[PDB]
Amino acid sequence: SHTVLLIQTSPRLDSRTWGDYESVTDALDALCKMFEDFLSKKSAAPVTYDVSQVYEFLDKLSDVSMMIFNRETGQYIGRTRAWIKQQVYEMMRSEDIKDSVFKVLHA
Amino acid sequence: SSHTVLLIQTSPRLDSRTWGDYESVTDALDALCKMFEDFLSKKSAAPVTYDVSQVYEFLDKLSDVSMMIFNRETGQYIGRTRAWIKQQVYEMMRGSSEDIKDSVFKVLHA
């Protein structure tokens, strides 16, 4: 299921970027890599994390949503921040954020 | 009338992928025309008139351009790619790599 990840890192409209993926799994795993690249880029230390932190990470993004291709309808399903948080949660068990986003999104 | 996401990648670089969203397909198509018009205005010395064929070649310089258009009947988004967008721009009209990114960002991001 082809998936487009729409991210806006700051309140500026020109911080809107996107990446696309072969499946939601990879798109959500991309967000997880962004998060743990961000938390690692924040401590001079090997850091562990709470659940509240992955949620706060996603809430620091001014905008984040996914377009997920549904092969039964040939159309994209739109999922917003609430859904993505839940998904990122169940998988995981300030211009410094833009660098974390661009690291995984565009490389 | 129906919400539209405009996806653009101005150049081969992945970091050049950007987007805007619009309340209307017409707004999204209009936005692409204003990107071209901005691009046209930077030419050294050109005629004051343009053909749709020049709007085509502008869309052909983008590495990627597509639209996701909200289907009010299904609540999902129909994807539409460059050739469809060209035909819609054409229908509307009858009614450098750094310079191309600049023109896109100027219109797409206000």
Author numbering:
A (entry chain A): 5 to 97, 124 to 137
B (entry chain B): 4 to 98, 123 to 137
Paper text:
By using functional proteomics, we and another group independently identified a piRNA biogenesis and chromosome segregation (PICS) complex (also named as PETISCO) that plays important roles in 21U-RNA biogenesis, chromosome segregation and cell division. The PICS complex is composed of TOFU-6, PICS-1 (also names as PID-3), ERH-2 and two mutually exclusive factors, PID-1 and TOST-1. The PID-1 containing complex is functional in piRNA maturation and processes piRNA precursors at 5′ termini via its association with IFE-3, while the TOST-1 containing form is essential for chromosome segregation and cell division in embryos. Complemented by biochemical and mutagenesis experiments, our structural biology data support that PICS is an octamer composed of two copies of each subunit, and unveil the assembly interface within PICS complex.
Then we fused a fragment of ERH-2 (1-103) with the EBM of PICS-1(PID-3) (180-200) via a (GSS)7 linker, crystallized the fusion protein, and solved its structure at a resolution of 2.40 Å. Two EBM molecules, named as EBMC and EBMD, respectively, are visible in the structure with each of them adopting a helix structure. The EBMC is accommodated into a v-shape concave via contacting with both ERH-2 molecules, ERH-2A and ERH-2B, respectively. EBMC mainly interacts with the β1, β2, α1, and α2 of ERH-2A, and extensive hydrophobic interactions are found throughout their binding interface. Taken together, each EBM contacts with both protomers of ERH-2 dimer through both hydrophobic and hydrogen bonding interactions. We found that the three mutants disrupting the ERH-2/PICS-1 interaction, including I182D/V186D and V189D/L190D of PICS-1(PID-3), and M38D of ERH-2, all display abnormal chromosome segregation and cell division.
